[PDB]
Design a protein around this nucleic acid. Structure first.
Lengths: 429, 53, 54, 54, 54
DNA sequence: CAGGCCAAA
DNA sequence: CAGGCCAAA
DNA sequence: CAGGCCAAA
DNA sequence: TCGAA
DNA sequence: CAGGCCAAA
DNA sequence: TCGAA
DNA sequence: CAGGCCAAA
């Protein structure tokens, strides 16, 4: 029996794209200094311990694609970032022969040079560190004396501007040449900071534990023997990272009266649940299903997130748990490792009258070549004969939305709770 | 087949100068194209002005 | 001599797509008949011989 | 240049050789994320050997 | 700079022949990339920036 | 290429 | 023995 | 060393 | 098959 | 000894 | 045989 | 990955 027709299925076309960048980063060797941070609003008073390792923003999309590539990627609905990779190699670390001070400087040819690398500090439940930018002192450029007012969003925007230049019509175009074009370096200014409670104003019982021994969670290498060596090599397969909303399916409300019918889910959890926790132990953890969310494509689409391009540099690529699909699915929380690299401050040769850490430090700079690759995928269904692409109903996607209309997304700038990332409302640019 | 150059850093895709394409145009503005409906001349196809739909 | 940079060229992405269709056609078996076509404009008067191949 | 001989002619051009040392950033720190604000003086030393045959 | 001046020139003592001495010759001509300046452009604008020449 | 989606396996 | 002619290859 | 130049092949 | 083995 | 905890594997 | 294979 | 374009070979 000859078969004139066979179930060939749909005509689905899948596209794959890869993006490569190479960056050169200069990080200063900040001293380990305790700084007092005043209480403000929900933030209590806390002591802050600065550290010299600068963070590598490999969790954001601008780190991988240029504005032109992002603008063209906007034209392919259903774009999912499948994988990312980053390799950090280190070059010769530079240490000043002698500081600006001359009376007691004792310039030296010999030098001790150590490189610190951290990979999982952000996910450690008890460290509760975060990324901050400091304001250095005039006499000791390696000694932080406060915190800059630049937020994480502003820091990443400035870094992207340094990477890709301005527009040709901008008056400040001559200030920052495109690093992607020139191959120059980009000074990194965001460094890790450990935190501990400030018990001076505490009334009643006090916690006097001090800082945790965070040095036990970082690698340290002799920078003299690390010249031209691979220091970091990380790969990350994204669980769910929709960069462009899927194609809008043909609504079944215009065809069938059955569109609102229910069907049994059984014991399987078809709807994602949001978990609220209280680290102050004043309230037990709560899990809530049917969280406020709405579709990101279709008749009642709310594309605020993608229109705002929050995923470019304001929100990380990895967004598992945030986005739900109507397909029978399983969803788990996802987060990315945090890469921190930097040179330890070199103590000055001058003597110290009492047993304590170094009082002055030599200027130092590390040289890091970062090679990053991002691989994505796209889908075009061609479900219907006419009217362009339409996707299947089971591919409909919803995003968590606040009661005030702002979408909810992951952020990696806030310290973790229970070794977990935190969902927060996106802020309009 | 399709191609996306990504020649420049910003502003979307731009192609190389050597990839610029021109099409034959009549003096009245209608483009000129092949048609296979007319009989051949010298075993060759004929160019004719396109007609607006 | 280690090479930190190399001439990697442009980032050109090439896409390939294919389209498949299956059609069923019915063609009638026309007779071979001579038909007279009148002259009109540049077209001269001509005899026309129909054929059954669609 | 054209010759009256039965010939074939095509456009010709020569490759452009550019060599040089990249500027070395000064060790001084920078307050904001940007390229180097000051650079150390540097010089490259190139021995060029050229031959022309006619 | 390469071949010196003529013996009758008054500036003959300024630049000794490099072909004779073997000295060096400072090169002063360097590459420059260009892009359009859209600040004064009226109407549509091209805001592509510099190409990644690295 | 049918059973809780298929463009997943 | 179909694609810029076929009686050319 | 003759046929679209020979000092070319 | 919201990493992936 | 980096990805939803590590003192679990 | 206006590179030259 | 230089010589009349490269995303062609």
């Amino acid at each position: 029996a000859t078969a004139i027709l066979r179930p060939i299925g749909l005509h689905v076309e899948k596209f794959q794209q890869t993006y490569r960048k190479k960056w050169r980063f200069l990080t200063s060797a900040n001293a380990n200094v305790i700084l007092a941070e005043a209480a403000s609003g929900e933030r209590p008073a806390r002591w802050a311990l600065t550290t010299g390792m600068a963070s590598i923003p490999w969790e954001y999309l601008f780190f991988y694609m240029s504005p032109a590539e992002y603008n063209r990627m906007k034209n392919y609905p259903g774009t999912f970032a499948k994988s990312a990779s980053v390799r950090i190699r280190t070059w010769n670390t530079r240490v000043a022969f002698q500081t600006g001070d001359t009376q007691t400087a004792n310039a030296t040819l010999n030098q001790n040079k150590f490189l610190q690398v951290a990979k999982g500090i952000r996910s450690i439940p008890f460290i509760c560190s975060t990324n901050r930018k400091y304001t250095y002192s005039d006499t000791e450029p390696m000694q932080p004396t406060g915190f800059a007012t630049l937020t994480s969003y502003e820091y990443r925007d400035g870094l992207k501007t340094a990477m890709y230049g301005y527009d040709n019509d901008n008056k400040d175009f001559a200030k920052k040449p495109p690093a992607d074009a020139t191959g120059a370096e980009i000074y990194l200014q965001d460094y890790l900071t450990i935190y501990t409670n400030d018990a001076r104003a505490t009334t009643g019982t006090k916690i006097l534990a001090g800082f945790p021994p965070y040095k036990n969670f970082i690698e340290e290498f002799d920078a003299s023997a690390c010249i031209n060596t691979d220091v970091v090599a990380m790969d990350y397969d994204f669980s769910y990272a929709p960069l462009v909303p899927q194609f809008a399916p043909v609504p079944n409300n215009l065809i069938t009266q059955n569109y609102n019918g229910s069907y049994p889910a059984g014991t399987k959890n078809e709807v994602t649940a949001a978990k609220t926790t209280d680290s102050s132990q004043a309230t037990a953890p709560t899990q809530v299903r049917n969280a406020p969310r709405k579709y990101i494509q279709g008749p009642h689409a709310d594309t605020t997130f993608f229109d705002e391009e929050q995923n470019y540099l304001r929100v990380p690529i990895e967004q598992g748990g945030i986005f739900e699909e109507v397909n029978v699915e399983t969803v788990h929380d996802t987060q990315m490792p945090s890469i921190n690299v930097g040179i330890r401050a070199v103590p000055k040769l001058t003597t110290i009258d009492e047993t304590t850490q170094a009082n002055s430090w030599l200027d130092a700079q590390g040289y890091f070549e970062v090679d990053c690759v991002l691989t994505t995928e796209s889908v075009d269904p061609y479900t219907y004969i006419k009217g362009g692409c339409y996707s299947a109903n089971t591919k409909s996607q919803l995003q968590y939305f606040a009661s005030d209309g702002r979408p909810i997304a992951k952020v990696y700038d806030n310290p973790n709770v229970y070794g977990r990332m935190q969902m927060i409302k996106t802020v309009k640019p």
